[PDB]
């Protein structure tokens, strides 16, 4: 029937309003935000060429660092930063092809579908070795905004990443299954994280990169030991706020 | 008839005779509660600051196309001298928390055609897009002086030179305007109403805002249907807005910003 | 436009950067010199209370538009821009079904009573200005005269009072 | 707020209607009609050059008669009338100056401010001698429309004005204070008096001066004895009817 | 006994505090402000050389005007003002002598002794003719800040001052006693009047004479008729606020 | 001992260890009631304005004599930028009504001698007396930059040239300083206290003040006994003051003054 869209909202009708029909609703709850995001999606990749018992040193190789910034949003080395920082845009890895892979790390599924302005959740991380060679790796988890501590070994032949009280994981041997998984709590000093854009600066002299919020992440993952590892994120107890537009899709 | 509406705020009052009601974003209102992140007792209930600040926004011509828009960064749009006591108090405080009560005005006639989308959006990019230059403190939170085109924001706008832009398919400041209607809004249809009334609560990444670094809310007026009229009809069609900060609370009193 | 006295002011399809009309709030304003309010006030020493400024839109039914009626208390002089005017007491008048707008100049004074007249303006005889601005241009379709006339009237408000009977400065009728 | 003046009346508002304000009303009653008009205002002047013990004879000298028509409205000799009649307009005394005094008598304060069409009241009259020479005068009051009785003395050396039953006053001597005051009741045959204009004639052949009502006064005052006397009117128990425009004032 | 004046106040002692003595208090109330100021004191002088039946015209003659500004504080023609205004200082009448009379009008007793910043009261005015010649005068009282109305006569040979609804007095004849007295209410728009200084301006462009408050008086008295008249003020229901220093007196 | 006193006001706090108590002028306090002469609801209870504003006043040297003084016009002394939110709010309002809570500070030593009279006076002449020029808006309400001598005010100071001054025996701005002690005050005796605490209510010729034209209150510091000290003792003796507007209420919101 008639209505007035200028009001800001119109009724949600079913066939019975205008015609001789009945509602046809069937129970369903797979559309709940918590359920939808509570599943692992590829969100990053990591690579290391140094052994376990050595000093961890930030490195890049064909767009792959040996450390990661835990955030579904695009992250990568920004303007020669020591470690990956959150990006404001995505770029192709190749300077020619004009086709993916991208050089930036992110949860494609989150970026392509995040119809909200802010979000809150815990993060379940999964780290998998890309080949079947027996794993031998040490990973260090650093809470959001905490010191990276990229120091020297304090003792000979020991993994420097394990030389911390920070949560760290150590997997090695033919009894293992070449993967690691764990869940970390929301650690940002912010109440909720911006899911897409942050209309502001992060410092008092407004010199930072406009668009990036301060400490908008779940911490970082530093890795040492041989191999390339893919990373998955699973959003636990996911909560979203303020509906907003989805990424535009080219017209068919 | 039931479309005549008056709204008082301090020593100001808006009046319309074609209202379609007031839309409350998220069905919430800023109640004026003090931020639990501040120990100092906030300064609040300042009547001289809880009023409507009216400003001219833009001229609507036949040249504007669907989705061309004007942005109004908040609270910055009122952080200037014309922000009265709201401004003078804001400039002398480190933090500010508030909602917004807004009415945008625009009249034409029974013989004009066209429509605008009036909406409020949190974390809506207000930076300048007519350059590849990094946004700065004095260029990031300004009320648009000219209508913004729409094409250059669908996939965002990277602050990089034109040749690099080729290898940058998407920027986080992207705005799929085809869905701008998902933001708390109202429509100003020339045949129906000459005013839109909105109100949104306080939302942000934290309890209260260090406003000097962040414009969390943005009032946006975009055309949905281009302006049309025949020879003889009034050609000057302008858009205005009355903006009221809802129960603003201030913390961290200090010397003023310049 | 020829310095003749008329009961209205004009407005059209534009928004001037200056007020359409400016009335100094004094029962002594030459602007209200022949209103019943001033005629009576001339025979009293002091007043107190609200003042009602009634505006009646006489344009066509097809004409629309919005005005910003502002009352600026003294101390910082007359408002020079819309930005300044809207920083004081104001009401936005939107045209439509109802033809008139009843605007009240609140009684804001350092003293309980204010003088009806004066030799030279003092803080007890002059109380600021009432200016009406064009918020949005008067808008209309073809076949409608560009100029609309807004009738202007004044009177004491609900809580308005006068006191102390006196004789005003005599003059020769003409 | 909005309203519609075409109705014939709009609301009397205070600051609270449109703004966050309070009524600021304070009790006051000096605006009451009765109170406002209950005070003496100069309304006429009289002059006589004949002694007390003589026959009263109507005279004029530089626009001053020795008798008065009791009415706040303009009065003066009209078209060689024996005694002053109510005028319809005010004229300057001087044919040149274009400045007052006027040749017509009236209560300037009443003429300049009479926002009503009709009025009702009693009249308190005050008569004062313009100089300090000992007074010696006789005044005769003649009710509205009653016979003037401008007859001869019936007895030698007596004031003819006192030769009546009409109310009359006689003041003389160094013990007096050169003035006279008294109050008379409304005596017109009309229920209420026209305060400004009377849209009609006073006789059946409509030959009178259009604009002047019949017997619209409080009577007359005839005076004999040496001197010039100023007259004041005080409107007792003043009642007014039908609001109407005030005299126009030149634009500043 | 000991005390500490820095406190801002010390005790009011009697002989019994330090010595073997008794209080010696006796009831007395002639020190009450209301009683003290409730008596007539010379406060002004007026002079006129024009007759009663004439047009009043502001004039000055050897420092005496024919009109007065009702205020105990110094008043006089200021910078060629039409009528007397409140002064900010007192000047000798003679340019040589360096001795009084002063050219300014005031209640010497009030100026020399007004140990308060603000005051409130009604004013009883007394006007006396300086010689025994029979009086014949008209006085017009104009409320604080009301129009002076220095207009022409509207009728020939009448005192223009009496041509008003303003309170006016008319005394004449050998039965009178050459004086006039009456009481007027406080009419200023100010709540209380400044008794000595007003640290501010009276207009919005701060161009007035700093030190003089706006409308700080009890109105004015205009007089016509022959003679010189002395004026007295009596402060009825006198109330004072905020104690302050008295006028300094030369050291003996 | 019982002379240690702390006083909080907003985000400020004064502290002294030699107080002799707080003197309340007229035994009254400004309660913050709205002026009955204004219909508009006043702006009040602004925490950011109800605090202590501290400023340096003058240097006390051996050259000052009894009754030489420094004047602090109110509210003007705080109408400048350093008046914080009290100032920024005041400048944007036609009227202001308030009382004052003040503490003047000045320390020396057990070996120094001298005393000051600290008092508040209503309608106390603050105009410049080092000229015969008429006081103006920008010269009448300024905090004294130099100590004022005393002789030229006993009989007042007429704004007339030196030769006319001869025939002008008395001016209404006279101040018989021998009785300055009749004003609400306290004494700062170097041997006793280093601070004085006063508070006065709102007094004026009317309900609320058009402050732009009137400085109704004046804080005055006058020396009673000249400063003395021997060779070796600290020579720099300075006077300071913490001024707090007590429950200020504002009416007549408008654009700012310049």
Curated annotation (Swiss-Prot), chains B, F:
It comes from Saffold virus. Coiled coil: none annotated. Forms an icosahedral capsid of pseudo T=3 symmetry with capsid proteins VP2 and VP3. Together they form an icosahedral capsid composed of 60 copies of each VP1, VP2, and VP3, with a diameter of approximately 300 Angstroms. VP4 lies on the inner surface of the protein shell formed by VP1, VP2 and VP3. All the three latter proteins contain a beta-sheet structure called beta-barrel jelly roll. VP1 is situated at the 12 fivefold axes, whereas VP2 and VP3 are located at the quasi-sixfold axes. The chain holds residues 154 to 411 of 2295 of the full protein. It is found in: Virion; Host cytoplasm. This is Capsid protein VP2.
């Amino acid at each position: 029937g008639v209505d007035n869209a200028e009001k800001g909202k119109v009724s949600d009708d079913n066939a019975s309003t205008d015609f001789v029909a009945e509602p046809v609703k069937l129970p369903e709850n797979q559309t709940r935000v918590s359920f939808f995001y509570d599943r692992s999606t590829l969100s990053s990749v990591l690579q290391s060429t140094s052994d376990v018992s050595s000093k961890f040193t930030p490195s890049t190789a064909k767009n792959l660092q040996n450390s990661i910034l835990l955030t579904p949003l695009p992250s990568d080395i920004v303007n020669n930063s020591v470690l990956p920082e959150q990006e404001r845009w995505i770029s192709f890895a190749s300077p020619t092809t004009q086709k993916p892979p991208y050089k930036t790390k992110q949860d494609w599924n989150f970026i392509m579908f995040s119809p909200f302005t802010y979000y809150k959740c815990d993060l379940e991380v999964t780290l998998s070795k890309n080949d079947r060679e027996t794993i031998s790796s040490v990973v260090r988890y650093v809470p959001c905004g905490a010191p990276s501590d990229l120091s020297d070994q304090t003792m000979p032949q020991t993994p420097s990443l394990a030389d911390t009280r920070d949560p760290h994981m150590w997997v090695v041997g033919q009894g293992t299954t070449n993967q690691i998984s764990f869940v970390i709590p929301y650690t940002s000093p912010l109440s909720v994280l911006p899911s897409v854009w942050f209309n502001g600066f992060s410092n008092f002299d407004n010199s930072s990169r406009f668009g990036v919020a301060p400490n908008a992440d779940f911490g970082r993952l530093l890795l040492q030991g041989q191999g390339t590892f893919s990373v998955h994120y699973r959003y636990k107890k996911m909560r979203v706020f303020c509906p907003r537009p989805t990424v535009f899709i080219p017209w068919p | 008839s039931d479309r005549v509406s008056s709204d008082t705020a301090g020593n100001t009052a808006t009046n319309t005779q074609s209202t379609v009601g007031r839309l409350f974003g998220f069905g919430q209102r800023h109640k004026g509660k003090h931020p639990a992140s501040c120990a100092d007792t906030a300064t609040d209930k300042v009547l001289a600051a809880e009023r409507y600040y009216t400003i001219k926004l833009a001229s609507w011509t036949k040249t504007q196309e669907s989705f061309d828009h004007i942005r109004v960064p908040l609270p910055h749009a009122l952080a200037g001298e014309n922000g009265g006591v709201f401004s003078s108090t804001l400039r002398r405080h480190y933090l500010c928390k508030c909602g917004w009560r807004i009415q945008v005005q625009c009249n034409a006639s029974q013989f004009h055609a066209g429509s605008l989308l009036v909406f409020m959006a949190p974390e809506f990019d207000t930076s300048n897009h007519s350059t590849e230059v990094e946004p700065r403190a004095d260029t990031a939170f300004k009320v648009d002086a000219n209508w913004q085109k729409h094409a250059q924001i669908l996939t965002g706008h990277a602050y990089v030179n034109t040749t690099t832009k080729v290898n940058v398919p998407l920027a986080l400041n992207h705005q799929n305007f085809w869905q701008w209607t998902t933001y708390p809004h109202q429509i100003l249809n020339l045949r129906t109403n000459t005013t839109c009334d909105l109100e949104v609560p306080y939302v942000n990444v934290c309890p209260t805002s260090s406003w000097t670094q962040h414009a969390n809310w943005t009032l946006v007026i975009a055309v949905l249907t281009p302006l049309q009229y025949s020879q003889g009809s009034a050609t000057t069609i302008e858009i205005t807005a009355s903006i009221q900060p809802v129960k603003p609370v201030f913390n961290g009193l200090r010397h003023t910003v310049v | 436009s020829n310095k003749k006295r008329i009961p209205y002011f004009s407005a059209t399809n534009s928004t001037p950067a200056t007020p359409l009309v400016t009335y100094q709030v004094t029962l002594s304003c030459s602007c209200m010199a022949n209103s019943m309010l001033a005629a009576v006030a001339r025979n009293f020493n002091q007043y107190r209370g609200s003042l009602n400024y009634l505006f009646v839109f006489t344009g066509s039914a097809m004409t629309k538009g919005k005005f910003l009626i502002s009352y600026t208390p003294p101390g910082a002089g007359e408002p020079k821009t819309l930005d300044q005017a809207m920083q004081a007491t104001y009401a936005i008048w939107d045209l439509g079904l109802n033809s008139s707008y009843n605007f009240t100049v609140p009684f804001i004074s350092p003293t309980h009573y204010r003088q009806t007249s004066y030799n030279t303006p003092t803080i007890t005889s002059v109380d600021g200005w009432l200016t009406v601005w064009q918020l949005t241009p008067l808008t209309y379709p073809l076949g409608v005269p560009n100029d609309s006339h807004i009738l202007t009237l004044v009177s004491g408000g609900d809580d308005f009072t006068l006191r102390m009977p006196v004789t005003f400065t005599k003059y020769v009728p003409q």
